[PDB]
Design a protein around this nucleic acid. Sequence first.
DNA 1: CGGTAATTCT
DNA 2: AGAAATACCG
Lengths: 142, 138
Amino acid sequence: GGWCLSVHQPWASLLVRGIKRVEGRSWYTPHRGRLWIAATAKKPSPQEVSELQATYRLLRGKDVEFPNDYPSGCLLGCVDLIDCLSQKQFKEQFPDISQESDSPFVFICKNPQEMVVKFPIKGNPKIWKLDSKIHQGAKKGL
Amino acid sequence: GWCLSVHQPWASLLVRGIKRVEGRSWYTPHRGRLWIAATAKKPSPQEVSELQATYRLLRGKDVEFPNDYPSGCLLGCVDLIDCLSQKQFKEQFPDISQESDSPFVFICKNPQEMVVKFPIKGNPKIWKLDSKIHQGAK
DNA sequence: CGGTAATTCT
DNA sequence: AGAAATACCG
């Protein structure tokens, strides 16, 4: 079926944009391939948005094109989770982006996709299974 | 459509009508149809047996219990007719007053049970179902 | 962030 | 079952 990871905004929208290229967690995951991204229920403050955008200007340049909305509580899109590296192997295998994450495990993401219509959703911990009908309509929407 | 997640084996007993109230620590304004989902917590066979004995005391020896108590799924619905404090519970329902000592007691009527139990992930308190999940529930 | 019969897994 | 988690709501 469809497997999903819930992420706090404004990080989540950066992930489905391809602006944020890794996701850092304290725990390891065997999951590979298509990983759906849902924003958690957390509402980001305007400060949180501007501070995160500033940090990514340091990391990816002044001409990063950020999203104009960071909606919470919805399915945003998907990435492909190609690898889950320890922090040590992250630095060694990705020294050009090693600075994007200080977490114990680092989810290596490619092929970011962003949905045009974001389906409302209530998330779960870690990587969890989408209800089959939201998943179906979600891959249709793409 | 609104849902309440309940631990097995209490959850299936609610949709059976065997369990007639749900006691919680908190008040809810919700009235009318309330869907009951089993939480993901699995009861031991021992716990199921002890609970069934308890409900044989309260409802008779020939209570027809469900044959399984599946976890993590939509089970059915009740009508939530009232949410009483423990006092108003003792006053208005003194014949089942012993069935719950909780700060608030949800009075449940018209229990209905689905034939196929749809798997579902719950949320705390009374939470809103997806309208299409709500559709298929009938 | 605390309250919650949320869900996950050794 | 009891830990654990970017669960959810207020």
